[PDB]
Coordinates of C-alpha atoms in Angstrom, one line a residue:
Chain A
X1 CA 99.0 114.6 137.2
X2 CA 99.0 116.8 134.2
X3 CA 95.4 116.2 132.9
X4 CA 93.6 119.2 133.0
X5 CA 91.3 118.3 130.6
X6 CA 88.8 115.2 130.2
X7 CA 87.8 114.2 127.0
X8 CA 85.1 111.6 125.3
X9 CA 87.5 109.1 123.6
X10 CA 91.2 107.8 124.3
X11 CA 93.8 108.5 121.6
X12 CA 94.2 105.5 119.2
X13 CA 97.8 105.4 119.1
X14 CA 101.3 107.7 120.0
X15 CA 103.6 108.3 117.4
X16 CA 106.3 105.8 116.6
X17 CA 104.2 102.7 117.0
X18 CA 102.9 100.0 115.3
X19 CA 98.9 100.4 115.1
X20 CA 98.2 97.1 113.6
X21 CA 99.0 93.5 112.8
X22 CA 100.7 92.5 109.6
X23 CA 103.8 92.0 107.6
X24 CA 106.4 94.2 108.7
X25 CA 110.2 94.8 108.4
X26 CA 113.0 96.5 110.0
X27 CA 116.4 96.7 110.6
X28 CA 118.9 98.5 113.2
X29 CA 121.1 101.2 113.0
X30 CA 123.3 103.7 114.0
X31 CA 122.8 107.1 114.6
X32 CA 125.8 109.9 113.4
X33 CA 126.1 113.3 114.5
X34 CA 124.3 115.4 111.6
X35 CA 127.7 117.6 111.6
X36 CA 129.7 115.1 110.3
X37 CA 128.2 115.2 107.1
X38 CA 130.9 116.9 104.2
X39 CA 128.7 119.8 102.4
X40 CA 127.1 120.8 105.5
X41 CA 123.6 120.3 106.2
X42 CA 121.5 122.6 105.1
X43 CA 118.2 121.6 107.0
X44 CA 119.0 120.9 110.2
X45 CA 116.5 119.0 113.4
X46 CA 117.2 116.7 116.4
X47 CA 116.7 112.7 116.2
X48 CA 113.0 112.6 116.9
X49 CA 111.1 109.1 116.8
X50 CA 108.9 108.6 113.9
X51 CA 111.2 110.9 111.4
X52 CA 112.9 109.6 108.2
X53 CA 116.6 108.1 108.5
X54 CA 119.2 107.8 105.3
X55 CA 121.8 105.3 104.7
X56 CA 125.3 106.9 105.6
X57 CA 127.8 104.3 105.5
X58 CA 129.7 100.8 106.8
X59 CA 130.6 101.0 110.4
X60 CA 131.2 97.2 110.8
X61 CA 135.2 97.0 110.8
X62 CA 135.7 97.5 114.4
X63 CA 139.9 97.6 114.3
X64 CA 143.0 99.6 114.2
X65 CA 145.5 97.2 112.6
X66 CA 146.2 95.6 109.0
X67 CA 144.1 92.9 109.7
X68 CA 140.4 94.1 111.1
X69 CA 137.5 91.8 112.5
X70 CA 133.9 92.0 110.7
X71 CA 132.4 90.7 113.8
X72 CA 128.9 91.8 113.1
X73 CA 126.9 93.8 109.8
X74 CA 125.9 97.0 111.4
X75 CA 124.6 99.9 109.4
X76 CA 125.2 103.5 110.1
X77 CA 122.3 106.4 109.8
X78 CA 121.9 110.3 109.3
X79 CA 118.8 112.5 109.9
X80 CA 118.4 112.9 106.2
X81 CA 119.9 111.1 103.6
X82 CA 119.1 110.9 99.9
X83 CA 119.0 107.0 100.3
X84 CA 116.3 106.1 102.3
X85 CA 116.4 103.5 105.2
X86 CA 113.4 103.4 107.4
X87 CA 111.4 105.6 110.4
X88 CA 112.7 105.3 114.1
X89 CA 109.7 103.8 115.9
X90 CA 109.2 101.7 118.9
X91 CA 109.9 104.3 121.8
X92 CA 109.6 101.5 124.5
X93 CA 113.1 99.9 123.5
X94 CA 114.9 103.1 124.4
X95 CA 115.9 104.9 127.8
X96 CA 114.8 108.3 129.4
X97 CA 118.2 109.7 130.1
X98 CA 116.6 113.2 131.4
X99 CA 117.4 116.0 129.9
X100 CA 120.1 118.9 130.1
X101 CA 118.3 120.6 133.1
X102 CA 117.1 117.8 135.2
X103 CA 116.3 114.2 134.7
X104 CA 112.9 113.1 134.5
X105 CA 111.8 115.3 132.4
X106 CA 110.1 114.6 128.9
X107 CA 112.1 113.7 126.2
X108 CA 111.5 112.5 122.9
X109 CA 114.3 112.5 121.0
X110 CA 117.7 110.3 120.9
X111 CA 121.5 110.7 121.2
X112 CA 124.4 110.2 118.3
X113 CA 125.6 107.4 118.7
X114 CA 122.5 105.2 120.0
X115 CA 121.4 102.2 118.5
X116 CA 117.7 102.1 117.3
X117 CA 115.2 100.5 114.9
X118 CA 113.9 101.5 111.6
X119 CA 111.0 100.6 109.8
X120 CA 110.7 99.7 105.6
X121 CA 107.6 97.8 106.0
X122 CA 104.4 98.0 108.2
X123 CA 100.8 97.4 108.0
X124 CA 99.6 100.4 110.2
X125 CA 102.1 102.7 112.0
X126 CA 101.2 106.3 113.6
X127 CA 103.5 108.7 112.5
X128 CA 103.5 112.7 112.6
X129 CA 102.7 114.6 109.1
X130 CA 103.4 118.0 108.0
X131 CA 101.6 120.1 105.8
X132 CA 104.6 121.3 102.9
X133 CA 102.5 124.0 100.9
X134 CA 101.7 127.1 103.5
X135 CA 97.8 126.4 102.9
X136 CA 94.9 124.7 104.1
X137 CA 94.9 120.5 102.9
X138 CA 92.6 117.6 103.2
X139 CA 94.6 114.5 102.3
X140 CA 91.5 111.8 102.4
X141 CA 92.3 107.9 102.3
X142 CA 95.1 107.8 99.5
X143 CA 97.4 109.9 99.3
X144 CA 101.5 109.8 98.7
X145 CA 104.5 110.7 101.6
X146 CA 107.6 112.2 101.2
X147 CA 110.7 113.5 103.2
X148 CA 112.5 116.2 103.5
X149 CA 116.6 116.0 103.2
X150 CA 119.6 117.6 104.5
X151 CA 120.7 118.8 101.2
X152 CA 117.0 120.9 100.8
X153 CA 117.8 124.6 99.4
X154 CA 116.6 127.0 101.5
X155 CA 114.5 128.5 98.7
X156 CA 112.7 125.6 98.6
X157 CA 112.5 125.4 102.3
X158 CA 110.9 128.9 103.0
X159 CA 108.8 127.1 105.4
X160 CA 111.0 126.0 108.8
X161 CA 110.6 122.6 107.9
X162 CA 112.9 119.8 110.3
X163 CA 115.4 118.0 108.8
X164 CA 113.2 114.7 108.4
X165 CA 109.4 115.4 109.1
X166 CA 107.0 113.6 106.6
X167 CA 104.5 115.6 104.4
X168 CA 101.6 114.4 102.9
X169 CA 100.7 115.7 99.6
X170 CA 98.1 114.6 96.6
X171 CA 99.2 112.6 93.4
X172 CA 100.2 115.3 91.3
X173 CA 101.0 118.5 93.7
X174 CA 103.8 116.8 95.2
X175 CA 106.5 119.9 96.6
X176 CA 109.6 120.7 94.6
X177 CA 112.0 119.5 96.9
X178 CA 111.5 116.4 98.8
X179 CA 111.9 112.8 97.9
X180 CA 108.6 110.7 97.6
X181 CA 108.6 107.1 99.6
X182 CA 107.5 104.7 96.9
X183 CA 104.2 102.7 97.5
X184 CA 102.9 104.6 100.9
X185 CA 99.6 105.5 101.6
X186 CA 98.0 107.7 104.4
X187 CA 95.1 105.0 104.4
X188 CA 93.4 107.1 106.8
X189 CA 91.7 111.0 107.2
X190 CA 93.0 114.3 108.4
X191 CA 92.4 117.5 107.7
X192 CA 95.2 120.1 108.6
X193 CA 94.6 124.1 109.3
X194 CA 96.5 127.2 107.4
X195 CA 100.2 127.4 107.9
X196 CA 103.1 129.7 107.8
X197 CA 106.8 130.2 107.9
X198 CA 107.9 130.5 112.3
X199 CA 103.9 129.5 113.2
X200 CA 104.4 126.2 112.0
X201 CA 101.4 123.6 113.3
X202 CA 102.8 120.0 113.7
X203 CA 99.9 118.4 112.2
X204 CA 97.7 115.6 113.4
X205 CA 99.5 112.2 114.4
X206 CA 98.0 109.9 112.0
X207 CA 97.9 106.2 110.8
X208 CA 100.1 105.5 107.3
X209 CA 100.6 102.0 105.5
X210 CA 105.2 102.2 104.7
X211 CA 105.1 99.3 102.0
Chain B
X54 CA 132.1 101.8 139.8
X55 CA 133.3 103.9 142.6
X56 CA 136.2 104.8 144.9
X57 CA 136.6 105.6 148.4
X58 CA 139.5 108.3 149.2
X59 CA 139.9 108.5 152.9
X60 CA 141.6 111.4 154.5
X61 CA 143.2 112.3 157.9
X62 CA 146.2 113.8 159.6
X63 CA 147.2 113.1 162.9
X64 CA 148.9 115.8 166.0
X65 CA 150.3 115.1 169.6
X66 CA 149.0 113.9 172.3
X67 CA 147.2 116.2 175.4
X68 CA 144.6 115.9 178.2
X69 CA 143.0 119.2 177.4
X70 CA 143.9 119.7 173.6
X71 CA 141.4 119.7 170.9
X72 CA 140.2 116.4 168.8
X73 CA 141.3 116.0 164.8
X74 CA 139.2 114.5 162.8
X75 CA 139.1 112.0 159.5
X76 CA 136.7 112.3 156.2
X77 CA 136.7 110.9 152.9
X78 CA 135.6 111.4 149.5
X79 CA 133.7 109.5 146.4
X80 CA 133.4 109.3 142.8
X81 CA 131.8 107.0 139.9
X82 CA 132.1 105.8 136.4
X83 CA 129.8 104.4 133.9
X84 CA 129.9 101.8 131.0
X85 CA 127.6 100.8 128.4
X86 CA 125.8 97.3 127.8
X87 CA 125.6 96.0 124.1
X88 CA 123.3 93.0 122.7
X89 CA 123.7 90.7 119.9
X90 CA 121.4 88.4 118.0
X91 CA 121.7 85.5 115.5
X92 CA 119.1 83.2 114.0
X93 CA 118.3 79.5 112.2
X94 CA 116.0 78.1 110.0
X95 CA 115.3 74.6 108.4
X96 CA 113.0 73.3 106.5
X97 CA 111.7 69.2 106.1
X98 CA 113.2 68.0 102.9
X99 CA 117.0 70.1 103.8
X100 CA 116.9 67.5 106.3
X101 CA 116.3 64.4 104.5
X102 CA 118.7 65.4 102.1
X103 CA 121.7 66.3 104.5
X104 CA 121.2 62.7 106.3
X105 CA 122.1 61.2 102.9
X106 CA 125.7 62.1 103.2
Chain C
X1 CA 150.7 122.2 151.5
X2 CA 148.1 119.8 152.0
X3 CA 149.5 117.7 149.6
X4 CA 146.7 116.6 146.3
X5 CA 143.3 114.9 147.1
X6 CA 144.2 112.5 143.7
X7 CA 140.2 112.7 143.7
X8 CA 137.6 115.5 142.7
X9 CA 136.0 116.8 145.9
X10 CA 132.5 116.5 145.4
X11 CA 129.0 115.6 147.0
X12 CA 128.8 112.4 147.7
X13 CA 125.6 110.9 147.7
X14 CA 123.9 111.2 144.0
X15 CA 120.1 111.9 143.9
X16 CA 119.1 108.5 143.6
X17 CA 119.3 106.4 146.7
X18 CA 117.3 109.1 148.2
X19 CA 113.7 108.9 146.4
X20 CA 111.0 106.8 147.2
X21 CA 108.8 106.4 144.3
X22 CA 105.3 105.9 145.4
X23 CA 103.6 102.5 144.5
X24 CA 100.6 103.6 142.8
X25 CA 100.1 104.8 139.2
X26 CA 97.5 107.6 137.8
X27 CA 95.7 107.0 135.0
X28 CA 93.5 109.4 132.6
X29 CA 89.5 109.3 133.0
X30 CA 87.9 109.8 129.9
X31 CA 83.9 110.3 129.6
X32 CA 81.7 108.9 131.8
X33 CA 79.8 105.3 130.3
X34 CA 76.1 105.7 132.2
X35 CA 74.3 103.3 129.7
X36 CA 74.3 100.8 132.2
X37 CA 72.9 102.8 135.2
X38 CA 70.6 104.0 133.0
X39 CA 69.0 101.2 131.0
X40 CA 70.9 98.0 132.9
X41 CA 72.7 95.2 130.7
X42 CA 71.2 91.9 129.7
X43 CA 73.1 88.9 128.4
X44 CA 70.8 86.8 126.7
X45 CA 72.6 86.1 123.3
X46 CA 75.6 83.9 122.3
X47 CA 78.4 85.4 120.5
X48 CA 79.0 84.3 116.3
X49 CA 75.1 84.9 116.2
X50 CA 73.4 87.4 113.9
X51 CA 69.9 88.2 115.2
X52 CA 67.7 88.9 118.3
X53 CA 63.9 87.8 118.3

């Protein structure tokens, strides 16, 4: 079903999982409604696996009264936030549930409100990248990521970029606007085509060493 | 979880009158399962040191 | 009249409970591999070796 095409190689690995063996960490989380942040979001893009998540708050009271129960430490998450906290990854701990039209359908992305797991450390994990300069870019073994946030000015975002894609970039022509991910590396090749603003290409899936 | 609803209504009697009839009616509700972990470690000399009191 | 139904008249059987999911899988093809039809295999070394003679 589907395949249309037959090709000389299987893919080495989907977005949002781990590629190899290795020290790793990660945490859980939970995800809030990007229009509950105060001074509006100016980039704006659903919760899709393998995108950058930010640090929004404590939701661990869990009462009403004077005196509250911390029965657990549970973390709360927004698309984008100045304060990073890990990539969503791991697609097989999550359900389906459809879409609006019908159920069964593809879906990729999840719900406010879900829980979910984000990683700060990993040897090799496949991830999406973005090209952030509106030009032709081979990134080659090492290279830096970055992020983009919620808080990104439009005139630095003249490009339709989503709230929390990842875009390679070289030591020093890192874009204006986004927030670098200390001590990440691309570790592997890609080469990505021309680009412009409405005609955006995703990118290659590729491998990426977090930490 | 669901429900059943039944419905009916019944008339008089006759030998030649027509035949009322019963139905019913259904509906759901969901919930939502949560999980909790929680972890130990120890190491060998913790141990021998803990016995001592 | 006709009183309230209490209940949302609806349909009552949902979706599921009425598909049968078949019990096979498909999977993608890739290339063909003809090296062996070709030339055949031999297995004449052991493995953690280095050379052939």
């Amino acid at each position: 079903m589907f395949q249309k095409q037959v090709y000389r190689q299987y893919t080495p690995g989907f977005p949002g999982d781990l590629i190899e063996d290795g020290p790793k960490r990660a945490r859980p989380g939970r995800i809030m409604s990007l229009s509950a942040v105060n001074p509006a979001a100016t980039a704006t893009g659903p919760n899709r696996a393998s995108r950058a998540f930010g640090y929004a708050g404590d939701v661990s009271a869990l009462g009403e009264g004077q005196p509250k129960t911390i029965a657990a430490r549970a973390s709360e998450v927004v698309i984008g936030g100045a304060n990073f906290f890990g990539v969503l990854g791991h697609p097989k701990h999550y359900a389906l549930f459809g879409s609006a039209g019908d159920s069964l359908a593809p879906s990729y992305d999840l719900p406010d409100g879900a829980e979910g797991e984000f990683f700060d450390m990993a040897t090799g994990l496949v991830v999406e990248i973005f090209n952030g300069a509106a030009a032709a870019l081979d990134l080659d073994y090492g290279d830096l990521v970055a992020y983009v946030p919620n808080n990104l000015a439009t005139a630095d975002d003249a490009l339709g970029l989503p709230a929390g894609a990842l875009v390679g970039f070289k030591t020093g022509s890192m874009p204006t606007g986004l927030v670098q991910i200390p001590n990440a590396r691309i570790v592997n090749a890609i080469s990505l085509p021309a680009q412009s603003a409405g005609n955006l290409v995703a990118g290659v899936t590729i491998v990426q060493l977090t930490q | 979880q669901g429900i059943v609803e039944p419905a009916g209504t019944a008339v008089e009697y006759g030998d030649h009158t027509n035949i009322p009839l019963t139905s019913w009616n259904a509906n759901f509700e969901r919930r939502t399962i949560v999980r909790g972990e929680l972890g130990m470690m120890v190491g060998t000399l913790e141990e021998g040191r803990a016995s001592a009191i | 009249n006709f009183t309230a139904p209490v209940t949302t008249p609806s349909i009552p059987t949902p979706i599921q409970f009425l598909q049968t999911w078949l019990p096979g899988f498909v999977k993608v093809m890739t290339a063909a591999r003809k090296i062996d039809e070709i030339i055949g295999i031999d297995t004449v070394g052991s493995w953690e070796d280095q050379e052939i003679v």
